[PDB]
Amino acid sequence: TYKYVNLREPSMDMKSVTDRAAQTLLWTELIRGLGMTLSYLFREPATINYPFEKGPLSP
Amino acid sequence: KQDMPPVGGYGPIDYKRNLPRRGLSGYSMFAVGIGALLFGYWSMMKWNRERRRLQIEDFEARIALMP
């Protein structure tokens, strides 16, 4: 069937521009999003120590 | 006879796409910016004027001697 993605007209009123004005000017974007999704560093590194450890196979 | 298809136990996982964790929007921002900015200016005039008081004190010792 259908789906129309990335197809949405803007708000264009008094208050909702302040959500798009604080975004560009003071960067509430790009740090709450992209500075937190990188860190996300505390997870365990899933590395195989190849001369000692070995991975799975199949019969 | 030992084939796969299980009787039950299913989800699924979503095809959904959403994480609107906002986030102090809509005039709540620009409010913590301005007040903390003038707070830094409020920290002035109690230090520069205070150092200005010591600045005349520093020049005082120069003028009192030197005859």
Q: Is B34 helix (H, G, I), strand (E, B) or coil?
A: helix
Residue from B17, B25, B32 whose CB has the most chain A CBs within 10 Å, to mutate: B25
How many helices (H) and strands (E) chain B has is answered by 2, 0
Instruction: Measure the CA–CA gap between A18 and B23, rounded to whole angstroms.
Output: 13
Q: How was this structure determined?
A: cryo-EM
Instruction: Measure the CA–CA gap between B63 and B57, rounded to whole angstroms.
Output: 10
Residue B27's contacts (CB-CB under 8 Å, 6 or more residues apart) are A15, A18
B30·A28 Cβ contact <8 A: no
Instruction: Measure the CA–CA gap between B2 and A40, rounded to whole angstroms.
Output: 43
- The helix or strand, by DSSP H or E, that contains position A21, with its residue range, turns out to be helix A17-26
Chain B residues with CB-CB distance to A3 below 8 A: none
- The helix or strand, by DSSP H or E, that contains position B39, with its residue range, turns out to be helix B31-43
> Å from B7 to nearest chain A CA?
26
Q: Is B48 helix (H, G, I), strand (E, B) or coil?
A: helix
Residue A18's contacts (CB-CB under 8 Å, 6 or more residues apart) are B25, B26, B27, B29, B30
Instruction: Measure the CA–CA gap between B11 and A50, rounded to whole angstroms.
Output: 36
Radius of gyration (Cα) for chain A, nearest Å?
A: 23
Resolution in Å, one decimal place:
4.2
* Whether A54 contacts A48, CB under 8 Å: yes
- Pairs across A and B, CB distance < 8 A: 21
Chain B residues with CB-CB distance to A32 below 8 A: 23
